[model samples]
Target: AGSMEVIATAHGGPEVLAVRPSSHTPDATQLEEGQVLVRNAYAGVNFIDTYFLCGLYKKPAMPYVVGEEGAGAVVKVGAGVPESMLGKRVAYFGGAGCTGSYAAFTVAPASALREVPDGVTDAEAAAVMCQGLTAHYLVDSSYPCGPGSTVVVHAAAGGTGLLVCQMAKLRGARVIGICGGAEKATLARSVGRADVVIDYVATPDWAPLARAAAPQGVDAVYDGVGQATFAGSLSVLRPRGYMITFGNASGAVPPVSPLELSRAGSVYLQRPTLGNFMRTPEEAQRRTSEVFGWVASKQVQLTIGREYPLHEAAQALTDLQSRKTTGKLLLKCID
Candidate 1:
């Protein structure tokens, strides 16, 4: 294949990925009302891609493309779409509820599109589409952290974690960031602005540090590491404290015993999805615009860990599943 897109033939592993050449380019005839066809410049890599590839999430029909988010300039539009949006640089994700983004071009619903601001690059928009929106909903809607509040952010050096930390700081919350090593801990404190940073790998026992950071107990705990930090996250919560378990980089947490929450101060456990938060067009715009607002003002920061060419989809997934990376992994789709 010379240049088409990566497709997943089956739900197994990264090895199942294969690139195929495309003979058709989507035009007004291929696009529908409220749809915009984008020439993909960059596609973001996330755990969800692996989840889909491995069938951990719902496996798509065999021989399906794999990706959740990407960004590029709109080349064509449908009847109901605004001509003004044509040629506008945009980023799209689950908000579109359309096809995958790991390709040369993607067709997205107008409602699902967000025009990237002037200062924000296409790569930046693509890399953060899902994660950034999740961060926005987590801080602004889910539990709502703000001044005089304290919270815990697991994987503080991660792509979403870094944004969560920065957003929480902007809201005036005291952040206790849990990370892997002295290096990550330092990066978390300096970049994420954690009031207290704990290197869990350097010292396996972290429950006490989380609890000790806020004697009265923190308002909420954002658990990105899932299974590995679930119990300890609860161990540090106060009565009725909230636990937002969003990512599963450490492996998905097993089924929970409702009794566990009762015993651990009745901590509220939530598993929120970006799709749920971006269900409606109104909601989608509000959430994404807020994230863009922060980015435009340089309030929220991000670290792009590594980038690979589009064909290196297998390698990207391998390294992501390796669990050694700190932030976002990207696939540079265009030349």
Candidate 2:
């Protein structure tokens, strides 16, 4: 066995991604007792990768990989795992040592991987893992939407936003989505099933419009945009409603006192991380399966709005940061 191609280093921008040979192959020493080796077909590009790239999140030591999700064929299986997993198509959330989906091969814990169902494609499987499971927890666990509940989703046309809007609607809740422009607003409404869509760029104070649309205010506000919409999001929640801040795409929110949540109509404020929701392998699998079912049944559409070559990973991140892309962004590795 010899080294395979990989994109290493967490420096600069996309240009920092270098394809080089390594002294590594998916071997017994590289895997635990029951882990499996995956020959990746595609890598899922996400906003979090941008944080790693810009040093917003601490960079790993040099020559590290830069992706978190991918779909691939299982090429080998370790002891105690069924050999059936080998040659099967699978998708995984966590990666090998580094975030190294920009490679031909990688390793995943046997328990952390799931077989891709018949209707799922490699691109779709890669796109759905992180974002789809996130939406599942936001709507099903954090807020638990139900009849008469009102929910506000910021960046409604973005990856997680679209999935959240659909999942919330499926739970019989009314959704108000806020996006940057008219096109995204329309997409949020038509594709995401948002009952109301507000263009934040156009209104500047679009939160008021969202509140106006909901009338009695929302039961929960999923504010992933962080600082740009944190205060406004709190302003639109009804008494005892929840405000789940899961991301900081618009910059981090400053520390606040409990008094703020109390003064804001006794609203609950929570900062949820993906790690918390997917603490157990069972929980992760259950959530991911729910999203896959939704996509297969055509209830929640997976939109691959943009696809970039593995080398264009930086461009993908730039598009997301600039709000120039909507829906899921995929990095094709098997091109």
Candidate 3:
């Protein structure tokens, strides 16, 4: 049977995407060694999808099957893979061989796949993999917040921001959340557990408010809203603090001058991506297990703000790019 999938026919905008029937259904005959075919139930909608669609990130191929993370049951296993993997429910994110997750079925290398715990639903599995892992690396490795540390999270009520807030709080940091509106600010404080929430829309010059929260200046700023918030992020950091800019949601940050860092407390600047942090199969599995475990144990709540049908992937991407939606956005690929 044919499968439905979203495709990026050209590198332009949401208008360039299309949902169509694909004749190729990956089966044992086509699977490479160490690869498995998964019947995907949900695909995660993320800002990186916009980057790929708009040419900010290089396309893997023209007329590419879009999306990078998904969750489902493994239906077929390639040679050299254990037969036990066939019926296991799993979730997979980035890897050279793990693209095309927007489809009903994706053929991904075994290393990219993680066995989803029994307590985790397909939607939760798909929603948490990318952003959860990104947040894990950010709080643990990127800055390592601890007791007495104060940090600001841009887009605090949004997907990754919410998780980062929860994790940083767990590590005993005083979390100050930054978002656009009052409602989202409430979510940031209630769901994300931020100590304070700053509405960026109400306070255009929000850095002063953040500094007021931490008189010595914040220990770090987890900023995913790139161009618009970069300068403000730099201003709120304490001496030698970290400014981690991990996404380009508001458009990529313009080229930064090194002297600016000296002027701004000699702060350290970094732009980290998930791929570099999860380089090996062991590293990938370790991180995935911790993230999935957190979701399953309710140590971190999974908030899926919206779900769109498989055919509405373009709309999902549009909402994700618009900055209005809170928490994780997912695509119900099976429908």
Candidate 4:
């Protein structure tokens, strides 16, 4: 008895994945208390996925599944969990001590499941579950941005970057988007709500462009583009401003001296993770609900860059790691 599963026998390239059968998919009666078996419909492919594959991020056991977020229906609910939970459409974004979702069926704790309301497709749920919550936390909590605030977002057309820009604008912040080329910069400005967009790929160093946008200096720098944009991000901030580095598209940043912060106008640096912010079930649910609400009301806009089938996961990873695509990438599982 085995369940079809896509797992990584080894870590190196996307070719490491293999779909095989196992005695892993449990029956309704076999489920432990407070657990749910979800028939996953779709899963998200993120840069973090590429990171884990290349051993840049934490590696699990030798063989492991390679997805972090997904949306589906609860086919079975364990004892102590309400039967009402069964058959409900739900989505999860890899937190609450359980985070694997790269198969036809994935097990999740009952408490971690967030019901997906009508009008939002399964693919849309899986698409935003991870990045949507991320954007919410970054914009709302990271710097408490609002009216009169000026922010710089690197990789403005990126998944999280786009949301950050849009949310920042919705909060009344002046956004200066920094992207690779003229085309992407234009896209960011139009769709991401960036008040000003800079063509970083045309040349280098967007610090001046950021400074030019907010002559008094920016209130915060959302630097997801690490290594390449690190120094410039710091230089563009106002005195006592915030520098938030949430990713490393180019490469990870090296060690820094405390004196660097002090010399650079005493800027504050923060590295945030969704796992840390959603430390409690109540809190996680609250933030997760907020994103869904925004989506429901059309306050926020999301873009899907590309999608591949479950079997094409290897190619999905290949495309994502290629660094040519933008926005959110997805792996369609059910249909």
On TM-score, the leading prediction is 3
- Cα-based lDDT for every prediction: 0.82, 0.80, 0.87, 0.81
- Point out the higher-scoring one by lDDT: 2 or 4: 4
Deviating ranges (above 4 Å) for candidate 1: 27-29, 95-97
Candidate 3, residue 90: CA error in Å?
Answer: 1.3
Ranking, lDDT, top scorer first: 3, 1, 4, 2
Q: How big is the positional error of residue 256 in model 2, measured in Å on the Cα after superposition? A: 1.4
Model 2 ranges off by over 4 Å: 1-12, 22-30, 95-99
TM-score of each: 0.94, 0.92, 0.95, 0.94
Q: Which stretches of candidate 3 lie over 4 Å from their true place?
A: 27-29
**Which digits, one per residue and each the tens of the lDDT, describe model 1 over residues 278-322?**
877789888878888888787887778677889998998898887
Per TM-score, what order, best first? Answer: 3, 1, 4, 2
RMSD score of candidate 1 (Å): 1.9
For residue 85, what is the lDDT in candidate 4? 85
Tell me the TM-score of model 3.
Answer: 0.95
Q: In candidate 3, what are the lDDT values of residues 93-192, reduced to their tens digit?
A: 7557775788888888887888898888999999988899999999988999899788899999999999999999888999999998989998899999
Clashing pairs in 2: none
- Candidate 1 vs candidate 3: the lDDT winner is 3
lDDT by residue (tens digit), candidate 4, 1-335:
23455788787888889876532464523777888888888888887777787788875476877678989898887889998887899998864445467777877888777889887788889978778888888888898789989988888888888889998888899888888877788779888989888887775766776787698779998888788888888889899999999987798888889899999899999988877777788887788777777777888888886777777888888887665635688877664
Locate the minimum summed-lDDT window of 10 residues in model 3: 21-30
Better of 1 and 3 by TM-score: 3
